[PDB]
Amino acid sequence: TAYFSDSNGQQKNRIQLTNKHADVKKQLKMVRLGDAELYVLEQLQPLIQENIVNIVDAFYKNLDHESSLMDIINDHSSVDRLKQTLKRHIQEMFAGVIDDEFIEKRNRIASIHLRIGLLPKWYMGAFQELLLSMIDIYEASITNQQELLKAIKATTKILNLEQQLVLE
């Protein structure tokens, strides 16, 4: 059979932003992230949620490479409390809806990371773990070759936007 569900219309109106975030609209289009794409992300969410624990375990384990990062973690919270908010943020990424409320949250996390002194270069590198981790979740849960790229493309898109918004 097939994995995703080809449904025209069950995709429309997934992007809902107002003047306050005029640019973001151009950004969503510059990465080919539209109604079709977001609806793809929504069909992946269940799949991501079911493996989020691993996703987040691999995540902090990967930062355990750069001592400083782990120090910044401890100085402000903890691995256990951070994993918790991370399982959440990552969830929302596949919500399939992009609106003002979705941007502004990014702005907040962007501000929080700056204050605590997280260097931007260590931020991008964090995503390379997420994407790789998700690539494998897909390749394993999605057998049809073509749909695997479909899913991989959608995520790289949403992840690019994450980086765009965090360091805007």
- Among residues 3 and 122, whose Cβ is nearest to ligand HEM? 122
- If one asks whether residue 167 binds a copy of itself (CB under 8 A), the answer comes out as yes
Q: How far apart are the C-alpha atoms of 41 and 19, rounded to whole Å?
A: 25
- If one asks whether residue 19 binds a copy of itself (CB under 8 A), the answer comes out as no
- If one asks whether residue 73 binds ligand HEM (CB under 6 A), the answer comes out as yes
Q: How far is the CB of 65 from a copy of itself (least distance, A)?
A: 5
Applying CB under 8 A, among 27, 45, 51, 141 the residue interacting with a copy of itself is 27
Phi, psi (degrees; rounded to nearest 5) at 99: -140, 175
- If one asks whether residue 28 binds ligand HEM (CB under 6 A), the answer comes out as no
Question: What is the amino acid identity at position 160?
Answer: N
Helices assigned H by DSSP within 31-93 = 35-49, 52-63, 67-76, 79-93
Question: What is the amino acid identity at position 123?
Answer: Y
Q: How far apart are the C-alpha atoms of 135 and 16, rounded to whole Å?
A: 28
Q: Name 75's Cβ contacts closer than 8 Å, sequence gap at least 6.
A: 116
- If one asks whether residue 141 binds a copy of itself (CB under 8 A), the answer comes out as no
Q: How far is the CB of 62 from a copy of itself (least distance, A)?
A: 6
Give the footprint of ligand HEM on this chain (CB under 6 A). Answer: 63, 69, 72-73, 76-77, 81-82, 85-86, 89, 108-109, 112-113, 116, 118, 122-123, 126-127, 130
